[PDB]
């Protein structure tokens, strides 16, 4: 079941990193028209 927990911890990080990337994409398009 440690594999089950390694899945969940890895999922939340994909999500968090995905959110950082999203916020940076909005900041970047404010200055690249």
């Amino acid at each position: 079941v440690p594999l089950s927990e390694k899945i969940a911890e890895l999922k939340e990080k994909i999500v968090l990193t995905h959110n950082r990337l999203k916020s940076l994409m909005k900041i970047l398009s404010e200055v690249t028209p």
């Binding site: 899945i7 990337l21 994409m25 398009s29 200055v31 690249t32």
Partner: protein, 38 residues
């Protein structure tokens, strides 16, 4: 994977999103292989 220019940051950030999009499918695939092996 360049950050010299705004145009390259843009290209590079989409590549990173495409990489995460591949990771999310790999995570799901692992979720199912595991669920099927218990």
């Amino acid at each position: 994977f360049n950050l010299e220019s705004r145009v390259e940051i843009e290209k590079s950030l989409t590549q990173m999103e495409d990489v995460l999009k591949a990771l999310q499918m790999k995570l799901w695939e692992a979720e199912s292989k595991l669920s099927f092996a218990t």
